[PDB]
Design an enzyme around this catalytic site. Structure first.
Site, mmCIF file in Angstrom:
data_model
loop_
_atom_site.group_PDB
_atom_site.id
_atom_site.type_symbol
_atom_site.label_atom_id
_atom_site.label_comp_id
_atom_site.label_asym_id
_atom_site.label_seq_id
_atom_site.Cartn_x
_atom_site.Cartn_y
_atom_site.Cartn_z
ATOM 1 N N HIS A 17 0.719 -1.137 -0.014
ATOM 2 C CA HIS A 17 0.088 0.033 0.037
ATOM 3 C C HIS A 17 0.881 1.232 -0.049
ATOM 4 O O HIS A 17 0.563 2.114 -0.622
ATOM 5 C CB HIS A 17 -0.882 0.150 1.243
ATOM 6 C CG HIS A 17 -2.182 -1.017 1.246
ATOM 7 N ND1 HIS A 17 -1.860 -1.918 2.193
ATOM 8 C CD2 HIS A 17 -3.054 -1.143 0.677
ATOM 9 C CE1 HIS A 17 -3.100 -2.798 2.100
ATOM 10 N NE2 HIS A 17 -3.694 -1.994 0.955
ATOM 11 N N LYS A 41 -17.215 -9.857 6.909
ATOM 12 C CA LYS A 41 -15.847 -10.398 6.701
ATOM 13 C C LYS A 41 -14.676 -9.429 7.698
ATOM 14 O O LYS A 41 -14.125 -8.691 7.312
ATOM 15 C CB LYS A 41 -15.309 -10.300 5.241
ATOM 16 C CG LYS A 41 -13.591 -11.123 5.152
ATOM 17 C CD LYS A 41 -13.502 -12.167 5.882
ATOM 18 C CE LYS A 41 -12.805 -12.046 7.434
ATOM 19 N NZ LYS A 41 -11.287 -11.397 7.177
ATOM 20 N N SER A 128 -2.621 -7.783 2.550
ATOM 21 C CA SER A 128 -2.964 -7.708 3.864
ATOM 22 C C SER A 128 -3.506 -9.156 4.517
ATOM 23 O O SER A 128 -3.106 -9.374 5.747
ATOM 24 C CB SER A 128 -4.345 -6.593 4.221
ATOM 25 O OG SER A 128 -3.680 -5.285 3.830
#
Lengths: 161, 161, 163, 161, 163, 163
Positions: A17, A41, A128
């Site tokens: 990122h 989620k 991630s």
């Protein structure tokens, strides 16, 4: 004059990122790091933790803003008066998914635009989701995330996970 | 202040190309349509024909330039003082190929940048290669290319091919 | 008039057990199957159109609802001229998938009645392609397991003629 | 004489599904729209709601039937005396998954057959999953689904959502 | 006899840092590595087989368990003749994956002892192929970063001869 | 020169004929093969680690150079601790290819001696996965053709316990 939205869950933010936003910040006037609340989620980190890890890791870039959102991306785009949304493409599955999303959002708003960046080779594998799984098994993620994220994972270990 | 190169052979240009450049022209100060000479392979149209078809179809966009080049993209990038190269990604094969090229070019020049756009669904099926083959068999390509390209195909028939 | 007619186009250079399986499978679900052998505009085939049509007939002639026909030119015009309900293609791998996806959309743009249906090869034929088979036979490798008997013989003839 | 099964969760049915069944209905004698109960990853709509939305949207096609089943596709295939199962292929991931499933089901039943259709470009971006997420955030899905589905989403808002 | 021998086949036209990395890595886990330069049957290589073998020797000769050999004909016959334990190939991208998957299955069908093992290139060499390198050098781009020194020189020679 | 030791990691929930084929193949080209059953950190397995190790032993114990060991998932530490020469993975489809490509690069970044070699399954096992097998067995489909006998029996035990 150009304002680009970089949306995601950032759970947590990673060096991948950081690289994309850095690169984006050199070619657009304004970059909005847009942290989706995470409608189901359920994220490991709270929105507030995530925003704070984003600020720490990217606050040195003076044309970058950090904002939480909850809603349709296309309404956030309109509300922000964005010129485009920016997304990373690591692999074929990302490519297909984003292709479809772009077409759907263009159908919802004809001014919608989506531009893509390809990660630099040293960050190509980083997501991630992968990082969470490695940290969950107490693997060392120091090489792949900012220092503040390493510390936030340590805190998360000393608590439940 | 931002200058992006859109490279390709444009043999011929299509409504797909026109859409991408139009979209690019709204978010960058300057867009250079860069027509590779293409002596790797041999194009149907001469560089001069191709430049002229590009000008006709996009000359209404005041921030777009048209320039022929040899193909050595990273040198052209430096010479043009470009902020990025822009490519379309129609399918998975494009994705893989451009991913690799971007990494190679970044290795040749650390300031190299490549941004990608995804075609809208009504142009996703169009490629110059497909269009050439249909026109070669006297199929109607009117729906997929500018008027000047239809005429250039007619001229090519009255000459040869 | 309620009847289905499907076109199965390709170069068939030569036909293989893979092709035979797909046509067999297609022949059970459509009234008529046209095996349509494209002439081979450049990337010149090993076998002549006539040889290819004849190898197709030998290998599939036992299926009474299968026809064998050479064509040249645009697939979409062949489709119209044949009054086909659909074109059938095999999908061996991801590259086939992408290419045929695009072709179907382009041909539907040329003719709104155009339709394309796909079959996936059974695992015992997944590795076979005419291109691979040619290369192995060219180096006198045994292709007996992968092609009909008549094709084995046509390769032998091609050797005795200087490939 | 031909009977093809089109299985899925249809949660909800979309214009994409409608197009595939319409296309299928022109080339097979009978089309069975087969709504899998949804063994976990619990659907938004009940099986009964889903069957009813399917009937409303496709009932005009006189050779189409609507039936709920458990997931065990190959047994359903035998029991229905089907000539084939029909599936849509939206993207490469669908391609790989269905390739494998076809081979596995042929191994369970040698009469098993699977045929595939590729969506037309105007429906390529639509999926039930995307549609649910947009409607959940009160985005307008009118362009992508039948009228009855718009209404069923409105009912879901006045209840849950 | 407990010893492993692996064949690394290709055209190597020219050899690149990608190839060098794979052979280096292979040389640490197999007793013998055969760099097998296919003659290039109608692949019309830029470099002669002899040039290619010599560029391979220069770039990899420091690895004492690596041999360099030209071959023609079927890979599977070369495999048998060399009493190889496996063939080794690189996988750069999805297209390579599909193609090699099929080749492995076909060759296993020709010879049940055939084996194919794959390596994935290190990230810094992921983009590199001989074909890409040729195209860049053909347009007088600098390939110094991607190929051994001897290959840079062989490209310079090729330019002075009309390339 | 030094003896080869390769790790074959996975959840093996349960082991299948696909796994058996890969390990068999691996066992012929490496001195030692460690079948490494990851504990299954969430996405909880159907079978306990102990059941899984035992099903692996039953199905592969006849290969004298194969060991069976449970581990946590942290593959690169397990690699170091085992003094492995490489990790071996099977590549069934494109998605496997992409995922493992990335993992190999990440693990090489954590440990420069890390190595990953890949095998491609033979066509008769290409469609089999543990996930698919579980779902078929859960719906009382017959999985006899795809898994060893001991796995069929372990599924029967699971049925008699209410699954």
């Amino acid at each position: 004059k150009t304002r680009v939205i970089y949306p995601g869950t950032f759970d947590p933010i990673t060096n991948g990122h950081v690289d994309l936003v850095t690169r984006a910040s050199r070619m657009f006037d304004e970059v909005v790091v847009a942290i989706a609340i995470g409608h189901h989620k359920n994220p490991l980190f709270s929105l507030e933790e995530r925003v704070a890890l984003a600020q720490s890791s990217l606050g040195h870039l003076s044309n970058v803003e950090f904002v939480g959102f909850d809603g349709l991306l296309v309404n956030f785009f309109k509300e922000q008066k964005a010129t485009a949304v920016l997304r990373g493409l690591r692999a074929v599955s990302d490519f297909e998914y984003e292709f479809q999303l772009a077409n759907m959002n263009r159908q919802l708003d004809p001014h919608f635009e989506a531009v893509f960046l390809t990660p630099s080779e040293q960050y190509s594998f980083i997501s991630s989701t992968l990082i969470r799984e490695i940290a969950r098994l107490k693997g060392d993620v120091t090489k792949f995330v900012p220092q503040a994220v390493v510390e936030a994972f340590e805190r998360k270990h000393q608590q439940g996970w």
